[PDB]
Amino acid sequence: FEKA
Amino acid sequence: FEKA
Amino acid sequence: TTHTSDFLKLNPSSGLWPASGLGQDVIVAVLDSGIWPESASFQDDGMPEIPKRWKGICKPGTQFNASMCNRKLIGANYFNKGILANDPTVNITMNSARDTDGHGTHCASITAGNFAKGVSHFGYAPGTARGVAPRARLAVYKFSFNEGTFTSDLIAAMDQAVADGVDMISISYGYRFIPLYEDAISIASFGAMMKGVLVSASAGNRGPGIGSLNNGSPWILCVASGHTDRTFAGTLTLGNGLKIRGWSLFPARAFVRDSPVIYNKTLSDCSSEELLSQVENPENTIVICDDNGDFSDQMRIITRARLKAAIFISEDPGVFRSATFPNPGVVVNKKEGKQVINYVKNSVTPTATITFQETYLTKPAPVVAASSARGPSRSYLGISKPDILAPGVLILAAYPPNVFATSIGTNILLSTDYILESGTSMAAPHAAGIAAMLKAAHPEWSPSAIRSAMMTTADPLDRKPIKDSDNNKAATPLDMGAGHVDPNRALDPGLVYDATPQDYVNLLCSLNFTEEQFKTIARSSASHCSNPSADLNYPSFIALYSIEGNFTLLEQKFKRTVTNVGAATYKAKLKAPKNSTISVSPQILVFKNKNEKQSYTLTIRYIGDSRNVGSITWVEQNGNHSVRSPIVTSPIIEVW
Amino acid sequence: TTHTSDFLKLNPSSGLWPASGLGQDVIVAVLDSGIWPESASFQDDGMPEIPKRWKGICKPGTQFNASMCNRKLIGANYFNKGILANDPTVNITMNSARDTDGHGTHCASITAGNFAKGVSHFGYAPGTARGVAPRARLAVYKFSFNEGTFTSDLIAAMDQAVADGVDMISISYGYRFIPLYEDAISIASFGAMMKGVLVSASAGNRGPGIGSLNNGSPWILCVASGHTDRTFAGTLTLGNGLKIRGWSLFPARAFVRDSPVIYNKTLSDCSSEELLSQVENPENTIVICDDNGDFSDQMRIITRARLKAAIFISEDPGVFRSATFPNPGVVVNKKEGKQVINYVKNSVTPTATITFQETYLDTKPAPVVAASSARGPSRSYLGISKPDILAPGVLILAAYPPNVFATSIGTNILLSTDYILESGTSMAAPHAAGIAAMLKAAHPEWSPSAIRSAMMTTADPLDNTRKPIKDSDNNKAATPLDMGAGHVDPNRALDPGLVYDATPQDYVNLLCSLNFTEEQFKTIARSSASHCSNPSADLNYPSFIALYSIEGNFTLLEQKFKRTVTNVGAATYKAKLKAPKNSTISVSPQILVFKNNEKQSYTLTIRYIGDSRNVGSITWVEQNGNHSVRSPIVTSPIIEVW
Numbered sequence A, B: 001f002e003k004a
Numbered sequence C: 001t002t003h004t005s006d007f008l009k010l011n012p013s014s015g016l017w018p019a020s021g022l023g024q025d026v027i028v029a030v031l032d033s034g035i036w037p038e039s040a041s042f043q044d045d046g047m048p049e050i051p052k053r054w055k056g057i058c059k060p061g062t063q064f065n066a067s068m069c070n071r072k073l074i075g076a077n078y079f080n081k082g083i084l085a086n087d088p089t090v091n092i093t094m095n096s097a098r099d100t101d102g103h104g105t106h107c108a109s110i111t112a113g114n115f116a117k118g119v120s121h122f123g124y125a126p127g128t129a130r131g132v133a134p135r136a137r138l139a140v141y142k143f144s145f146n147e148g149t150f151t152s153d154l155i156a157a158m159d160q161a162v163a164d165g166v167d168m169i170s171i172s173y174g175y176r177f178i179p180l181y182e183d184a185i186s187i188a189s190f191g192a193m194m195k196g197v198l199v200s201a202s203a204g205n206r207g208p209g210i211g212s213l214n215n216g217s218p219w220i221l222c223v224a225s226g227h228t229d230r231t232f233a234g235t236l237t238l239g240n241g242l243k244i245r246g247w248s249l250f251p252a253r254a255f256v257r258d259s260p261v262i263y264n265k266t267l268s269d270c271s272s273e274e275l276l277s278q279v280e281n282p283e284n285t286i287v288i289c290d291d292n293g294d295f296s297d298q299m300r301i302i303t304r305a306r307l308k309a310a311i312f313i314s315e316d317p318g319v320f321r322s323a324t325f326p327n328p329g330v331v332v333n334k335k336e337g338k339q340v341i342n343y344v345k346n347s348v349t350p351t352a353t354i355t356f357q358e359t360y361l362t363k364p365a366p367v368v369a370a371s372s373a374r375g376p377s378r379s380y381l382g383i384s385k386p387d388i389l390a391p392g393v394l395i396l397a398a399y400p401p402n403v404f405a406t407s408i409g410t411n412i413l414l415s416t417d418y419i420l421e422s423g424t425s426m427a428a429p430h431a432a433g434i435a436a437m438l439k440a441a442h443p444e445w446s447p448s449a450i451r452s453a454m455m456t457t458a459d460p461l462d463r464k465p466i467k468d469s470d471n472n473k474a475a476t477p478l479d480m481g482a483g484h485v486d487p488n489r490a491l492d493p494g495l496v497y498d499a500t501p502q503d504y505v506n507l508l509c510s511l512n513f514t515e516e517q518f519k520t521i522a523r524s525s526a527s528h529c530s531n532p533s534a535d536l537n538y539p540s541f542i543a544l545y546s547i548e549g550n551f552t553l554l555e556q557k558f559k560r561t562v563t564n565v566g567a568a569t570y571k572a573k574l575k576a577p578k579n580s581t582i583s584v585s586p587q588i589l590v591f592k593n594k595n596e597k598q599s600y601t602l603t604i605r606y607i608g609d610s611r612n613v614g615s616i617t618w619v620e621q622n623g624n625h626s627v628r629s630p631i632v633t634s635p636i637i638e639v640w
Numbered sequence D: 001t002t003h004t005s006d007f008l009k010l011n012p013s014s015g016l017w018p019a020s021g022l023g024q025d026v027i028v029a030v031l032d033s034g035i036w037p038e039s040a041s042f043q044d045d046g047m048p049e050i051p052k053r054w055k056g057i058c059k060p061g062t063q064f065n066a067s068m069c070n071r072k073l074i075g076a077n078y079f080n081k082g083i084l085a086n087d088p089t090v091n092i093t094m095n096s097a098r099d100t101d102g103h104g105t106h107c108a109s110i111t112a113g114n115f116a117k118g119v120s121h122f123g124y125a126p127g128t129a130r131g132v133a134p135r136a137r138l139a140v141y142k143f144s145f146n147e148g149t150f151t152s153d154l155i156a157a158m159d160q161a162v163a164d165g166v167d168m169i170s171i172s173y174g175y176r177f178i179p180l181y182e183d184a185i186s187i188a189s190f191g192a193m194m195k196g197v198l199v200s201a202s203a204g205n206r207g208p209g210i211g212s213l214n215n216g217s218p219w220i221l222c223v224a225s226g227h228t229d230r231t232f233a234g235t236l237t238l239g240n241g242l243k244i245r246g247w248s249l250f251p252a253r254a255f256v257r258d259s260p261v262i263y264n265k266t267l268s269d270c271s272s273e274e275l276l277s278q279v280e281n282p283e284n285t286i287v288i289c290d291d292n293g294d295f296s297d298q299m300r301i302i303t304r305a306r307l308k309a310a311i312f313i314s315e316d317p318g319v320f321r322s323a324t325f326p327n328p329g330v331v332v333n334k335k336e337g338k339q340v341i342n343y344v345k346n347s348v349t350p351t352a353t354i355t356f357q358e359t360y361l362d363t364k365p366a367p368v369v370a371a372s373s374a375r376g377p378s379r380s381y382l383g384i385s386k387p388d389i390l391a392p393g394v395l396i397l398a399a400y401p402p403n404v405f406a407t408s409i410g411t412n413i414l415l416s417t418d419y420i421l422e423s424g425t426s427m428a429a430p431h432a433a434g435i436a437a438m439l440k441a442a443h444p445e446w447s448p449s450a451i452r453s454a455m456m457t458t459a460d461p462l463d464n465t466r467k468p469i470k471d472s473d474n475n476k477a478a479t480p481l482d483m484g485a486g487h488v489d490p491n492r493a494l495d496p497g498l499v500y501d502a503t504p505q506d507y508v509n510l511l512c513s514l515n516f517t518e519e520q521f522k523t524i525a526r527s528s529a530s531h532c533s534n535p536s537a538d539l540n541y542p543s544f545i546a547l548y549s550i551e552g553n554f555t556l557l558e559q560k561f562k563r564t565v566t567n568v569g570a571a572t573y574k575a576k577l578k579a580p581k582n583s584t585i586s587v588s589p590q591i592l593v594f595k596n597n598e599k600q601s602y603t604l605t606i607r608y609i610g611d612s613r614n615v616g617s618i619t620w621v622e623q624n625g626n627h628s629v630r631s632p633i634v635t636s637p638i639i640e641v642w
C-alpha cells in the first residue's frame, strides 16, 4: 500500500 | 555624528 | 492551483466552466486522510444552496462537530472499524475526519477548493488558489488514520460515498503485487462503475520502470502526472553581469549579494562535511557543487555546513519535483555550470548574487514526470494504462496549518496554509473535477462516456509530442495514456466510446476467476454471467506480444462502437505503430442524427522483440470534430 | 506605521487629517541618507497636482535620473561636496539621492508615506502602511553617504531645503559635546526658524542618563521616543495546558509543536557553547535560559548550537526594542519563567509548543518612554526644557531598501525586505514633523513657534490606563526631561484655543542673551540677523524649567517667568496649578478674559529649593468651553553645559  |  | 486552471485553459467566458457552472450542482467525494475544514479553500462565499438530492451526514468526532460542514464542504465521514477490529486496544488520537497528515486536505482543495485570495508557498506560486472545479461540492471520507490504514475501511468508505449519491470519486492511493480479487480500490471501483460513478485514481509514483503502475483497472480512470509550465527561480547574477535564471525553492527572501564564490575540486564534490568545514568565512562564501548524481545529499552537506549559499550543477529530474531547499542556493544545468566555473577560474575576487521567491510561467510543457508509474497494468494487461495525463508536479493546494511543511537550516521546521506537493496524488483530483464538470454539462453521460470524452479529446502534443522526463523521448500511451487533459474540448467530443454496467460484468466474466473470486469483486451488483466478452468498448488499443521465445508475425482484431453525441460523417485517419501495419473497417462512418451508434473494427499486424505507438482518429468531414484513440504494442510481462 | 496613525487617533472622518487634507498641500523635507524611490510608499496613487509654489529639482546621479520624481516624491537632492573636499580621491559608489543605508527611506515613509497595501515585517505588524501625513509632499535631501557624513554638507542640505520653500524639516541625526556655535544642526535650525520653518529632530538614543539628549535647542522641536500598544507574540503552550503570550520576533512561521523541554541548571545560564553542545538531540529539544542580564548573548549561543528553540527568562527593556531574533524562541517575565520551570521539574516528558508571527494591539500601559531615549535638560542650553514632546519610536514599521541586510535567521542566513521594524528617536521625529506639517496646512498663518505650541499644550501626559506616562527605565512617572509635554495628540492640536507665539526677532533677542563673542554670534545667526540691542532670555515658551546650582549650600530660590498667550479660539480661562513637589507656584493674573487674535500676558512664579527633578504644571481651562492649555513645569540641577 501507498498514498500517492 | 550619529544617525538616530 | 494558483495557475493550474489557467494552464488548462478553464475560464468564465467559455468552455467547461460556464457550461458546468464551475460544478455548483455536482458532488465529488474524496477518500483520503480527512480534511482541515477551517481552511479558506473550503469556505462557501459564492456558493448557492445545497442540492436537495444530497443527504450526507457531517459526522461528529474529535475536534469536529456536526456544524463543521457548509455549502462547500457538504459532507464529512470517517471509517475506523478496520483499525479497532484489528486491535481494540488502540487509542485513536484524531477520531474524526479532521486531517492530521495533509494529503487529504491537499487533494480536496485541488479538486474543488473555493477561490482563496493572496496565498502562496513561502512566496512562491503566489495568487488566488482554486480547485479545477471551484464550485463543486465536497464530500470527505476519511479511511486513512495515523494509527493505520485498512483495506476494509477503504472499501467501506467508497461504498458509503456511492450510496450517498456522490457524482465522482477521487482517490489518491494505490496497492501493488495483488490480483484483482484482492485489490481493494478495484473491488470498490467496480461497484462504483456499476452504479454510474466514475473513479479517478493515481497511477502511482514508482515509475519509470515498466508495468509499475497501480489502480490499472478497466473500470477506473488511471491518472498520470506531468509538469506544468511553471518554474521557481533564484536568478543568479555573476560579478561580470552574467545573469542566469536557475532553480530554487528556498522558503524565504534570503539576501545573498556580491558574495565571494569559489570553485575547488578538492571539495567540489560537496560530500565531505570535514572538507567543507575547512573553507574559512563559510558564512559569507558561495561554494560550487559538481553534478555527482546525488543533489539532495549535497544540499544536506551544504545546509549542515552553513554556507552563505551554493551553486549546484545538476539536471537530475528529481530536483525539479522537490520543495526541500533548506539552504540558499541555485541549481543550474550543465552548460550554465561551465559558464559559472569559467568566470570563477578567470578571476580573483569572483562574486555572485542570487534572489529568491521568484515564479515564472517554460518550454516544453507539459512533460511526464519520471516517477509517474507506467503500464501496462499488471492487474490486467488487456487494457492500456494509464488513461490520461494531468498536472501533478509541485502543485499548490491547501494544507493543515499545524503540521510539518518544509525546512530551513538543519533545526528550523516551518508550517503553512498552502504548500507545494508532487505526485500522481495531485494529478488524479484534477481529472476528478474535470469529470465532475463534464457530468454537470451532460447529466445523462455515463462514467465510461465521460472518460471517453476526456481521452479522445486529449492533447498528445506540448507543438511537439509530449516528452518523458526520464529519457527525453516521446511519451508513450503507457506513460501518459491518451495525453494531456483538455477540458474545454472534452465538453464537445462529437463521438464517445460508451459502455454499460453489463459490459463490465461480461468483462469480469471473461477473466475466468473461480466463482468465489468472482463474487469477491462483483459482489452484489451481478450474479455468476453467460455472455463472457473480453473486448470492452474502450477508447484505446493495446497489442500484446509474448517474449518467451522466437518472435513471429502476430495479429489482433479490436471491435469498437462509437455513438454520436454531436447528422455527421467521419473518416478514419491512421498512423500505425512502428514495425507494424493497421487497418480499419469501415473506413467511413455516417450518422443520420444524434445518439445513433456505429461500429467498426481495427486490426493490427505486428511483431515484438519495446513499446511502439500509433493511433486512429475519426475526423469529421463537415465540422471540426476529431476523435482520437492511441495504439500501443507491448510485451507480455509478469501479472499479479 | 500599519497602526501608528490609529494609535494617534488620526482618521478621514474628523480631526487633523480631514482638516489638512492629509497634508496634500504641504511639503516636508527629509534630511538623511537618501531614499529608495521605487518603494510603494513613495508612489502617487491619490495625489493631486504638485503645488505650483514648488520649483525644487530632481537632481540626477548614480542610478537616479530626473524622471525619478512624481507627485509624491516631488524633490530629490544630494550634497557631497564635504566628502570630496575632505578627499577627492574617494570613489562615491552611490553618488545621488538613492538610499544605500535605509535610515532615510524609513524616516521618509514614516513622515509622508503613501498608502501601501499588504505589507509587514516578515509577517509581523501586517496591514496597510502609511505616513502620519499620507498626502504630504516629500523632498529628499541626502547629506549622509556610506563614504562619509559631513557637517557642512548637512548645513548645505537644510539651507537648500529652506530656500526651496519647504514647510517643515525632519532630521534624525544628533551631535553631542559641542557648544551652539559649533552645532551644525542648531546653526541651520536657527536659519530655518528665522524664516518660519520648524525643525523636528530626534532627541538621541543615549538615555536614560541625565542631560544626555541632543538637538536641545530653543529653535528646534526636540522629540523623544515612546513605545506603542503593539506587541509581537510567541504564544507558549506547555504540555499541561498552560498558555502564555510571550515575546518573539522570529522572522518566519516556525513549526515547534509538542517538543521536549529541558531545564538543567548546569547550562540554564546559556553562556557556554561547550555546555550547550552537550545537549543530545539539540535539534528537537527546547532549552530554558535563566535571566543573566545578557539575553542577546544567550540568543547567540542558542543560535550557534542550533536548538529547536529556547525559552528566555528576561524583563530587560532592551529586548523589546530589537528585531534581532535569528532562532525560534520566546521571552517571558520572571513570574511566567517560574511557572515554566516548575512544570518541567514536576514532569518526565515535559513538552511545549510555540507559534509565531503574531501581533497584538492591546498592550498596557502605553505609551511608555523608551529607556534609551535621550534625557534633558539640554547641555546645549539649560535655559529651556527638553525634550519637548513624545512620539512613537519603538519598533516602527516603514519602507526599506530591498537590497540591504534587514534581519537574520540561523548564523548564516541574511534576509531582506521592503518594510522593516526599527527603533529610536529617528522614528519619532518624523511622526512629529508630519503632524507639524498638517497643522501648518490647517492654519497656514501659524508660525513655527505657534505650531509647536499647539502640539505641546495639547499633548497628553497620561497613558491608555489614564495614569501618568511611565519611564521604561524605572517604571516611575516620566518627567518633562523625559517626554516634554507628553504624547502627541494631533486632533486636539488642531484646536488648542490658545498659543504661546513667537517671532524671529524673539529668537535674536534670546541669542544675544547667551553673551557669545560677536564672531560666535555670527557663526550661528549668519545673515538672518546682525549683532540686537534688546537682550531677553525669557523666551515665550510653552513650558517652564527652574534651575538650581548644586555647588555648595542649597537655599530657597525664586524665579519669575513672563508669558504671553494669543487667543486662537471670545472666552475666559482660569489657571489650574499643580506645584512641583517641595516648592510653591503662583500665577497672575489668575484669570484671563478675551474679547475676540487678542493677546494677553501673565507671570508665573516658583519658590523652590535644590537637593532631583520635580514636576508640576499650569493649565488654563476655558470656563464656557472645553479648551485646556497645559504647560509642564520642572525643577532641575545645573549640570555641565557644552
Ligand SMILES: *[C@@H]1O[C@H](CO)[C@@H](O[C@@H]2O[C@H](CO)[C@@H](O)[C@H](O)[C@H]2NC(C)=O)[C@H](O[C@@H]2O[C@@H](C)[C@@H](O)[C@@H](O)[C@@H]2O)[C@H]1NC(C)=O
Binding pocket: C089, C090, C091
Ligand atoms: C488509552 O487511553 C486510556 C485513558 O483514557 C489509558 O488508560 C488510562 O491511562 C491513564 C494514564 O496512563 C490512567 O491514569 C488511567 O487509570 C488509565 N485507565 C483508564 C480506564 O483510563 C490507556 O493507557 C493504557 O492503559 C492504562 C490503564 C495504563 O496501563 C497505561 O499505561 C496504558 O498505556 C490508553 N491506551 C494506550 C495504549 O495508550
Ligand SMILES: *[C@@H]1O[C@H](CO)[C@@H](O[C@@H]2O[C@H](CO)[C@@H](O)[C@H](O)[C@H]2NC(C)=O)[C@H](O[C@@H]2O[C@@H](C)[C@@H](O)[C@@H](O)[C@@H]2O)[C@H]1NC(C)=O
Binding pocket: C264, C265, C266, C267, C275, C278, C279
Ligand atoms: C581547496 O580545498 C582544499 C581543502 O580544503 C584546500 O586545502 C586545504 O587547505 C587548508 C588550509 O587552507 C588545510 O588546512 C587543509 O589541510 C587542506 N586540505 C587538503 C585536503 O589538502 C585548498 O587550499 C590549498 O591547498 C592547501 C593544502 C593549502 O596549501 C592552501 O594554501 C591552498 O590554498 C583549497 N584551495 C586550493 C586552491 O587548493
Ligand SMILES: *[C@@H]1O[C@H](CO)[C@@H](O[C@@H]2O[C@H](CO)[C@@H](O)[C@H](O)[C@H]2NC(C)=O)[C@H](O[C@@H]2O[C@@H](C)[C@@H](O)[C@@H](O)[C@@H]2O)[C@H]1NC(C)=O
Binding pocket: D089, D090, D091
Ligand atoms: C576609483 O575608480 C578608479 C576608476 O574606476 C580606479 O582606478 C582604476 O582602477 C581600475 C582597477 O584597478 C584600473 O583598471 C584602472 O586602470 C584604474 N584607473 C583608471 C583611470 O580607471 C581607482 O582605483 C584606484 O586606483 C587604481 C589606478 C588602482 O591603482 C587601484 O589600486 C586603486 O584602487 C578607484 N579608487 C579607489 C580608491 O578604489
Ligand SMILES: *[C@@H]1O[C@H](CO)[C@@H](O[C@@H]2O[C@H](CO)[C@@H](O)[C@H](O)[C@H]2NC(C)=O)[C@H](O[C@@H]2O[C@@H](C)[C@@H](O)[C@@H](O)[C@@H]2O)[C@H]1NC(C)=O
Binding pocket: D264, D265, D266, D267, D275, D276, D278, D279
Ligand atoms: C546537565 O548538563 C550537564 C553538562 O552538560 C550534563 O553533563 C554532561 O553530560 C554529557 C552526556 O550526557 C557528558 O558527555 C558531559 O561530559 C557532561 N558534562 C558535564 C559538565 O558534566 C548533565 O548530564 C548528566 O550528567 C552527565 C555527567 C552524565 O552523567 C549524564 O548521563 C547525565 O544526564 C545534565 N544533567 C541532566 C541531563 O540531567
Ligand SMILES: *[C@@H]1O[C@H](CO)[C@@H](O[C@@H]2O[C@H](CO)[C@@H](O)[C@H](O)[C@H]2NC(C)=O)[C@H](O)[C@H]1NC(C)=O
Binding pocket: D065, D067
Ligand atoms: C531613467 O530611469 C528610468 C528607470 O528605469 C528608465 O526607465 C526604465 O528603463 C528601463 C530600461 O532598462 C526599463 O527596464 C524600465 O521598465 C523603465 N522604467 C520606467 C519607469 O521608465 C529611463 O529609461 C531612464 N531615462 C533615461 C533617459 O535613461
Ligand SMILES: *[C@H]1O[C@H](CO)[C@@H](O)[C@H](O[C@@H]2O[C@@H](C)[C@@H](O)[C@@H](O)[C@@H]2O)[C@H]1NC(C)=O
Binding pocket: C065, C066, C067, C068
Ligand atoms: C462546535 O463547533 C465549534 C468548534 O469547536 C464550536 O466553537 C461550537 O461551539 C458551539 O457553537 C458555537 C457557535 C458557539 O455558540 C459556542 O459557544 C458553542 O459551544 C460548536 N458548534 C455547535 C453547533 O455545537
